[PDB]
Design a protein around this ligand. Sequence first.
Ligand SMILES: O=C(c1cc(Cc2n[nH]c(=O)c3ccccc23)ccc1F)N1CCN(C(=O)C2CC2)CC1
Ligand SMILES: [Zn+2]
Length: 200
Amino acid sequence: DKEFQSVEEEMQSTVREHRDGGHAGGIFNRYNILKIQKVCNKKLWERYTHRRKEVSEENHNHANERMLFHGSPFVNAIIHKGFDERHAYIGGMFGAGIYFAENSSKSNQYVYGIGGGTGCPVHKDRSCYICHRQLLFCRVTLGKSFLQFSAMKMAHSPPGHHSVTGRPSVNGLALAEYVIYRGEQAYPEYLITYQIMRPE
Ligand SMILES: O=C(c1cc(Cc2n[nH]c(=O)c3ccccc23)ccc1F)N1CCN(C(=O)C2CC2)CC1
Ligand SMILES: [Zn+2]
């Protein structure tokens, strides 16, 4: 499957060297991709496309849809129930929203919790090369995205906007991040099962 090869390439090619020296997500340059599953949840897809059409109509017939990563210990609840802003990241740089990265390694830092939590459930290792990790590769409707550089605790998107784009800056973000404030503005399209690999 070329669809799956495209997802593996997005995963591999978006890895970056993290400022924390791998404290949160581990030390690696690449992954061992074990499985890529397409999520087909008709109810979630209908909620997503219904919202995507509304946002498109409010944004000059353009949804501004992107494929983005999301790492979380709650990936299995997300696949069944969808992203839920009632469980949004309050402590987040851009307030109470649902957060995504365009770099797979940034999302990998959240797979076991904030700052990688205590790592894998079995070895309590944030850099575990044994335990199988899971990330989501999502369809996200950004619509009219508010470009922001510094911390801005929002409860909802700014007036006239459908999302917030956190752009990198000198005394700010190392890498981009994308925030939606409505769970129906993202669809968890692919569930990726993988391992981070020990460097060569
Ligand atoms: O957006 C968050 C969230 C994000 C984060 C940070 C984060 N988590 N994952 C990322 O991939 C990421 C990428 C760039 C910047 C930050 C992140 C932390 C706690 C959170 F609750 N959600 C929590 C998990 N979600 C749910 O619907 C849970 C299942 C009930 C979706 C929304
Ligand atoms: Zn482990």
